[PDB]
Structure formats: structure tokens, C-alpha cells
């Protein structure tokens, strides 16, 4: 209802850096809110693309931001009659960023890795890696759970089981309230996809520079499968956490598998041991059902509801014609030992090729009426195709079909305005939660403030 579209703030990164590809609010020990922005095509210090991360302090006038510094030097280690190698060129540092407590986790899903042993190798592949930073102390740590030291031939002899070479760890990411980092790795197990989880504290305490292959004893990875429904499913393209089984002592995970079962797509709700609690199947092949997932209670009953996005959904129209517009599916959580059912609401985009449901952000209670609200992005929506973000307010009955407010892109064509989104944090301390929108195509982030 009330985000100010006139009084925006713009934060800018370097040309061609994709500043705004990912973002999050980060709060320091004192309590001051800043904005973490990922910029996965930022040039490194040797003019080669490595990606980068920026920490922006809140200013009404916005502007440039300091670079949260990370080690962009490749590493080599000759140990145990092998040669371990990291490759940070084109790694896409900041393709995902997430904040937890006083920690920032920025990931490079296309960081490559190889192990040489005489004339053999593991193969130079994108295992992915996450860089962890603690701004107020300077501490750095890394996490790269898919790195192995198994040679190519052995995978072949074992029919490519437990093949983590193409994980792209940190493609998606989320952190629980307790401090468990959960990474989506959609290239895991020969492109089925997997999840890796580990406590943030343990990542820091087990990491030393130059080791490259090390143990995080408390880590837990998901499982490989011979079920063809999972092949090429990109399970972990998106990830999120919530409470979906009544037991508050446990945390449930929501995983996006947008090409699951021959491109039908799926989202799964899992316990923290990775046992399936529920599966939500996509509606239409190639719709990318599971591109986005969002967890928030919108109907005010204290039970987390689930939102799933299928940005390439094609709507039926006059004379048997289909029209790619995108769709978002709302699933309200019922009471008792009852699973998620059919959707309570379908929100369909209106602009052709708009990719409505490309991103879904919980906003918190934007107008303080009691019900939490969400924002949905159509990165190429609006009459002009410049991009659009639509606010839907919560009510007793779920969400409204009619958006309360539409935010048109202030940037030019190709900005991908809305491709990334974050809310539910009051950046200016006025008592109302605000919204940050990324437009990686324009190398900028826009901050919208909520008002009485």
C-alpha cells in the first residue's frame, strides 16, 4: 500500500559488473542496517572477471559503495602425491549473498577446481565455493563442500555415483536463525542437484588458508539417486527455510527443482535430515516452477505459507493460443498433521515475456495491519518491458489477487529490475519495513522506503 516511489535511493556499481545480481540487508553488532550487494562480473585486480561484493551503508542519497574485500588469488597445493588447484576466474563471486548475525556469506558458484595426479585428473569443473566474512573483525573463511580428490577414471568405473564435480555450491543460499548455512548446488550428483549444510561457527573454526581440502565434521550433504524423475532437475536452484511440521525444535527446508521430472518442475519441503515431507509438482512443462520460493505467514494464523514462482508459465488465451507471462502459486499451511494441499491462489503475470514470479520477497507487515505482505517481480514486465515489482498485501483469506501497488522500473531497457529483491527490514528506523530491488543489467540497486 505504502512504498514511496518518488523518493528512491540508488546505489551504483561498476559498468558490466552486474552490481545488484544479489543483495541482502546486513545488520552490524551496534544494530546499524547496511546493504550487501553481489556483483558477479566485477573485474579483479588483474583485469580478469572474478566477481565481487559491496557493503553499502544506509544513505538517503545513495551512491558508490566500498568493496568487501576477498582473496581472488588462485591456489595450488602439492600434497599427498596430488596437485590441488583452485580457479577463481569467471567464478561469479556474489552470484548469491546472504547475511546472518555479524557474518556475510558471498558465493562464487562457478569457481572451478581440479586435482592432478601424474597423467590423470579429477577434471577442471565448477564445484563452486562460498566466501565468509565478519566485517567488524576482519575474519575470513571459505566453504567448498563439493571439492574432491577422486580421479576421473574412478567416477567412470562407478557409473558416476556421488559425482560432486559440477555442484556449483552456493548457486542458492539461506541461513537458519540458529546459524546453519544451507547451500543449493543444482549441478550436484551429475546435475540432479544437492544441498550442503554446515554451522557457520564450524565453517570458521575449521578453515585455514592454503589447505583447500578440509573437513567440516558437522556438515551434512543430501543424497544421490537413480530415480530418473530427478535427473537434470537442478534440485537446489533455489532454497529457503521455514516451519512446516509443527515441531518448533526442528527446521524444515524448501528446495526448488525447476526442471524436475522432464522439466515439469517441483518444490520439496524437507526435514533437516533431507527426508521429504512434501512435494509440490509444477503445473506446466518448461514453466520453471521452482525458480523462486518464498516462506512467510500471509494469513495471520502463525503458520508459514509457501510461495513458488514459475516465471515462464504460459497462460491460455483466445483461439487455443498460449502466452508466456509467469505465475506465482500460494500454498497456505493448514492445522494439525495435514500436508500442504492445492494452491489457495494463483497470481498470473500480464505482460508477455514478463517473467512474473522471477523473484518473490517477504516484506513483513508493510502497512502494519496484522498480516504480512509480499513483493513479486516481473523483470521484463510493464507496458514498456522495463520491469516491474508488484506488492500484494496479506489478509485472512490469503493474498489479494489485485496488487496494492505497482513499482515501475526507473532504469532503461535490459536492467532486469526486480531480478533480485529483499524486504522485512527497516533500514531508516521509521518503524516500517522497506524494500531493496536489484537491477543487475543497470549495475544498480534501488531502495524504496515505507511511510505512515
Amino acid at each position, epitope marked *: 500500500l505504502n512504498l514511496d516511489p518518488v523518493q528512491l535511493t540508488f546505489y551504483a556499481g561498476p559498468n558490466g559488473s552486474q552490481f545488484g545480481f544479489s543483495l541482502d540487508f546486513h545488520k552490524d553488532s551496534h544494530g546499524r542496517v547496511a546493504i550487501v550487494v553481489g556483483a558477479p562480473r566485477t573485474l579483479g585486480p588483474s583485469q580478469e572477471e572474478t566477481g565481487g561484493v559491496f557493503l553499502c551503508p544506509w544513505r538517503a542519497e545513495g551512491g558508490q559503495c566500498p568493496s568487501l574485500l576477498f582473496d581472488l588469488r588462485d591456489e595450488t597445493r602439492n*600434497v*599427498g602425491s596430488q596437485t590441488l588447484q583452485t580457479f577463481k576466474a569467471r567464478q561469479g563471486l556474489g552470484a548469491s549473498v546472504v547475511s546472518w548475525s555479524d557474518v556475510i556469506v558471498a558465493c562464487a558458484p562457478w569457481q572451478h577446481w581440479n586435482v592432478l595426479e601424474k597423467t590423470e585428473e579429477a577434471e577442471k569443473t565448477p564445484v563452486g565455493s562460498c566466501f565468509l566474512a565478519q566485517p567488524e573483525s576482519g575474519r575470513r573463511a571459505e566453504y567448498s563442500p563439493c571439492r574432491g580428490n577422486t580421479l576421473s577414471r574412478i567416477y567412470v568405473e562407478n557409473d558416476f555415483s556421488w559425482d560432486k564435480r559440477y555442484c556449483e555450491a552456493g548457486f542458492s543460499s539461506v541461513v537458519t536463525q540458529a546459524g546453519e548455512l544451507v547451500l543449493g548446488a543444482p549441478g550436484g550428483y551429475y546435475f540432479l542437484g544437492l544441498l550442503a549444510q554446515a554451522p557457520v561457527a564450524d565453517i570458521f573454526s575449521s578453515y*585455514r588458508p592454503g589447505i583447500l581440502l*578440509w*573437513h567440516v*565434521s558437522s556438515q551434512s550433504l543430501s543424497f544421490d539417486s537413480s530415480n530418473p524423475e530427478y535427473f537434470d532437475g537442478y534440485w537446489g536452484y533455489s532454497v529457503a527455510v521455514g516451519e512446516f511440521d509443527g515441531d518448533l525444535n526442528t527446521t524444515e527446508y524448501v528446495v526448488g527443482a525447476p526442471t524436475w521430472s522432464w522439466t515439469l518442475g517441483a518444490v520439496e519441503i524437507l526435514d533437516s535430515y533431507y527426508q521429504r515431507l512434501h512435494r509440490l509438482r509444477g503445473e506446466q512443462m518448461a514453466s520453471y516452477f521452482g525458480h523462486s520460493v518464498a516462506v512467510t505467514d500471509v494469513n495471520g494464523d502463525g503458520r508459514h505459507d509457501l510461495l513458488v514462482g514459475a516465471p515462464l508459465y504460459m497462460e491460455s488465451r483466445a483461439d487455443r493460443k498460449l502466452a508466456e507471462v509467469g505465475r506465482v502459486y500460494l500454498f497456505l499451511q493448514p492445522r494439525g498433521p495435514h500436508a500442504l494441499g492445492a494452491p489457495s491462489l494463483l497470481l498470473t503475470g500480464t505482460q508477455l515475456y514478463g517473467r512474473f514470479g522471477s523473484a518473490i520477497a517477504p516484506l513483513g507487515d508493510l502497512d502494519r495491519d496484522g498480516y504480512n505482505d509480499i513483493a513479486v517481480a516481473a523483470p521484463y514486465g510493464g507496458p514498456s518491458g522495463r520491469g516491474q515489482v508488484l506488492v500484494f498485501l496479506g489478509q485472512s483469506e490469503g493474498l489479494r489477487s489485485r496488487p496494492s501497488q505497482v513499482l515501475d522500473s526507473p532504469f532503461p531497457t535490459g536492467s532486469a529490475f526486480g531480478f533480485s529483491l529483499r524486504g522485512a527490514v527497516d533500514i531508516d528506523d521509521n518503524g516500517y519495513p522497506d524494500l531493496i530491488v536489484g537491477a543487475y543489467g543497470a549495475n544498480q540497486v534501488a531502495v524504496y522506503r515505507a511511510q505512515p
Partner: antibody
Amino acid sequence: EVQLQQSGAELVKPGASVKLSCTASGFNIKDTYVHWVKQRPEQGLEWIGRIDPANGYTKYDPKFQGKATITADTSSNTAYLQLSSLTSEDTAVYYCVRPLYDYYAMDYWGQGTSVTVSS
Amino acid sequence: DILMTQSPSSMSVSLGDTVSITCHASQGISSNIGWLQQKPGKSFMGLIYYGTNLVDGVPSRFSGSGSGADYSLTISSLDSEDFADYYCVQYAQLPYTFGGGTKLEIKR
């Protein structure tokens, strides 16, 4: 608390075999490489080999190829070392070892199993 | 195989001394070295991994240094419990190989 609990002292006859065990306590044996090391008063420490219990794959110093067979069982969380054709040179103390963090390191050690070959 | 030559084989030192044990590899092992302690009649405890990193719980008075083929373990301000045997191990190549050991002994 990580702790490797080795089996008790062995008194065995030359030409026979013996099988020592190392049971993981406070962790799972499949978590890391497990190594076996021989110690003798005069000749010092010798590395025998290692196993990756996750998959069973092994490596050995050529000196012990054919005498030593390392195995592991993730059901019982135990690693094993078997020595065939016992000689007087096999009279030694044997340790199982594993790393703390570094895949390749040798940081945590069992209490040692003593083997005496005698007629 | 890589030959790890450890020196000295023994030293007679006193409480509060700072002492160093050195270890020379037969080739470069680029910090792929561990230091181990064995107290009288006891088993082993890991002190250092990858050249300089203290194993969890190990006192700060132990420290590792060196590079290439030459490394040192330094104990600062010897405690009574530090009178033990110490060994280096390399894991740059298989087979892993150990130094011959250094024994700390009480001077009198």
C-alpha cells in the same frame, strides 16, 4: 570429543596372522582417511597405509604391500589392520591415525596396540 | 621416498627455556609437515598441521615455522609436561615419512 579406541595387546606366533581394530568414538569412521602407523624403539615410526572408509579405497607403503591389509566397516564404525606371515620384525606398537581438518594431516592418534611375535 | 632428518636427537634443557627442534626434508614439501608429541609411555598428540597451524587445544607456547625443505618447532618457556619425544611427519608425498625424533631431557 574425537577418540580412536584400539584393541588390546596381542601375543601371537610367528607365521600366523593377527587383526587389530580401531573403533571411532565421538565421530563416524567414514568422516576422514584412517591411517595405520608402526612404532619400534630402534627403527622409529613407519607409515603402513591408509583407507577411505567411505569407499574402501586403500594406499600402502611398498614395504608392507602383501603383509598389511587395511579394511573398515562403517556399520561398526571400526577400521582394521591385518598382518599376515608374522615375523619378529612385526613385534611393534601399532597406531590408527586421522586428521583434524586437513584431509592429508595426521593429528588424532589411537592409544596404540602392542603386538609381540614369539614362539 | 622423502627422508625426514630431525635434529637434535636429544637436548638437555631446563624449565622456562625456549628451544627449537628442526627437521630437514630431502626435497621441498611446501609446509606439508606435521609435528607430534609423545610423552613417556603415552601415545601421540598432534601439535601442528600444515607447518604452522596449532591443533585445537594445543597451548600457544608451541609454534611451527619454515619453508621449502627446512622446518622448526619452537617451544617457548618449557613446562614440566614438555619433557617428551617430538617427531615431524611429511605428507607432501606418499608414503608419509617420519623424522627420527627429538627427546627433551632435564639438564642437571
